[PDB]
């Protein structure tokens, strides 16, 4: 099998979720944070022709950056990984799929509860600002029938009170009150526009980011509030 700068790209991303990854034969890759805070899944170009466990995902993505695009990835006769570049050959380990934290099946979202979208451009403006503004916690609520995001700094106001930042996401059509609170630490997804499906049942709830390329599902936090 052969991996493309497009997919080597989508993986450096799943490295910010789990240091390792489980990939089974196919066009589809999933991973989940060890502590279950984040779940990613995607369908890909390059085709995955054998199963394997990768303990180091980000360091092997580092070693595949040193060969040519034409390089042929195969299971090694000796069961590890052989990367054959044209003039060269590299040997990288496999761990057993016990020490890498795989989800079982590709967790399907429920019927959503509310839905909005976000433009690629406006994701940039959030992440990039959070650093400066020290926005470590954000909240999706409604304002004037129009859903806004809100940045806060949780250490400064533990209460999510002085809202340091806000971005209006689109019109809110239905009728419900909600404050969903997401830890900036779980936002691991790559940039671009996402359809946003969030769901809540009492002390239940979750937020799915549906991208063009891969899907992302992020846990809410416990002070999150709503009637649904």
């Amino acid at each position: 099998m052969k991996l493309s700068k497009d997919t080597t790209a989508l993986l450096k991303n799943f490295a910010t979720i789990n240091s390792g990854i489980m990939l089974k034969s196919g066009q589809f890759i999933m991973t989940r944070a060890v502590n279950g805070t984040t779940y990613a899944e995607a369908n890909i170009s390059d085709v995955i022709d054998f199963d394997v466990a990768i303990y180091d995902l980000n360091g092997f993505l580092g070693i595949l950056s040193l060969v040519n695009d034409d390089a042929e990835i195969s299971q090694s006769e000796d069961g590890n990984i052989k990367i054959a570049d044209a003039r060269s050959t590299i040997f990288w380990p496999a761990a057993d799929p016990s020490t890498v934290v795989a989800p079982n099946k590709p967790i399907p979202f429920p019927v959503a509860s509310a839905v909005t979208e976000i433009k690629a451009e406006d994701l940039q403006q959030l992440l990039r600002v959070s650093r400066g503004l020290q926005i470590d916690t954000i909240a999706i609520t409604v304002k004037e029938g129009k859903i806004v995001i809100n940045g806060f700094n949780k250490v400064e106001d533990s209460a999510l009170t002085r809202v340091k930042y806000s971005l209006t996401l689109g019109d809110y059509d239905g009728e419900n009150t909600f404050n969903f609170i997401i830890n900036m630490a779980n936002m691991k997804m790559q940039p671009g526009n996402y359809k946003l499906l969030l769901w809540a049942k009492g002390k239940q709830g979750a937020a799915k980011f549906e991208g063009e390329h891969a899907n992302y599902v992020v846990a809410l936090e416990a002070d999150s509030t709503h009637d649904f």
Partner: protein, 320 residues
């Protein structure tokens, strides 16, 4: 059957580790106190400490989370340094369990000295996240848990059963072993050997199983295997007789014979002289053997140091 098998493993004291809280062999009040919890449906903070290993702590930690359907994160205590708490443990605890499950962090074997600072950072953490998430701690030695942490936890103390519980718990293990035998294909010719395994290393139910593993070499426990478990390799009659007669040439000769396992022989001696000698000579024989035992292993020539015990006895010991 009623027993759990992990079937993903061969090591047998780990193949049979209990799935639920009912399977665990526990003192009366300790079981009751756990069933109670599994009821309330939410788990408080809990410390489970041995200090004798293999009493079920790390099993019950995993158990409780199962019986409550916890959303659980298991952690090696010694891997649990401070920045671990800060990043992953804190992410986990701040995460909304979205299917409405108790979040529980099991920190196994947390009693290392080095982890003090991590445990300190933890003291304000367990308070901030107490609504969402709770912590179960396992330790061999409590004093390695800073006091402020024992305040915050229900401290349950394993392996100190009452005289009544010991007897009952053992009886429960003999049955539990028997049912393992049925499962593994080991056949029991004499039951006395299953009982003797349980009694021999009691407090610890792990080595109690892995002792059954290694005495099953031949696939049967017969009254022969019983000899090794209880092991008395003994005929001490030759020494006892020479001590009565207060001679040396004979004692001096027997010393190099028992130089082999001194630890065992000293036992079989204290055992059989205790009955055969006078009451105030009993208080002495312990002073005499007890001292000889202490300094063994400092003693250069074991054979000689054994002779010195024989002379010491023949002189002061008295009986008919």
């Amino acid at each position: 059957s009623m027993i759990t098998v992990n079937e993903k493993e061969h090591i047998l004291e780990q193949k049979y580790r209990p799935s639920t809280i009912d399977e665990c062999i526990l003192p009366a009040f300790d079981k009751e106190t756990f069933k109670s919890i599994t009821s309330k449906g939410k788990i408080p903070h809990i410390i489970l400490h041995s200090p004798s290993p293999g009493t079920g702590k790390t099993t019950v930690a995993k158990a409780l989370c199962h019986d409550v359907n916890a959303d659980m994160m298991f952690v090696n205590g010694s891997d649990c340094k401070i920045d671990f708490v800060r990043g992953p443990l804190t992410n986990f605890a701040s995460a909304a369990s979205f299917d409405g499950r108790q979040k529980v962090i099991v920190i196994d074997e947390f009693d290392r000295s080095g982890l003090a600072e991590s445990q300190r950072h933890l003291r304000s953490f367990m308070e901030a996240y107490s609504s969402n998430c709770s912590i179960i701690i396992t330790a061999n030695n409590i004093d390695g848990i800073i006091k402020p942490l024992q305040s915050r936890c229900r401290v349950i103390t394993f392996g100190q059963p009452t005289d009544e519980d010991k007897i009952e718990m053992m009886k429960q293990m003999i049955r539990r072993l028997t049912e393992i035998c049925k499962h593994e294909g080991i056949a029991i010719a004499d039951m006395k050997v299953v009982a003797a395994l349980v009694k021999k290393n009691f407090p610890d139910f792990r080595k109690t199983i892995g002792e059954l593993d290694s005495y099953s070499s031949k696939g049967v426990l017969d009254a022969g295997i019983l000899s090794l478990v209880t092991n008395d390799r003994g005929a001490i009659d030759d020494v006892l007789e020479s001590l009565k007669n207060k001679d040396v040439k004979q004692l001096r000769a027997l010393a190099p014979k028992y130089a082999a396992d001194y630890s065992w022989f000293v036992g079989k001696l204290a055992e059989e002289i205790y009955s055969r000698v006078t009451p105030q000579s009993i208080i002495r024989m312990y002073e005499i053997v007890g001292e000889n035992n202490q300094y063994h292993g400092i003693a250069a020539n074991t054979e000689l140091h054994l002779a010195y015990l024989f002379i010491q006895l023949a002189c002061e010991m008295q009986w008919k």
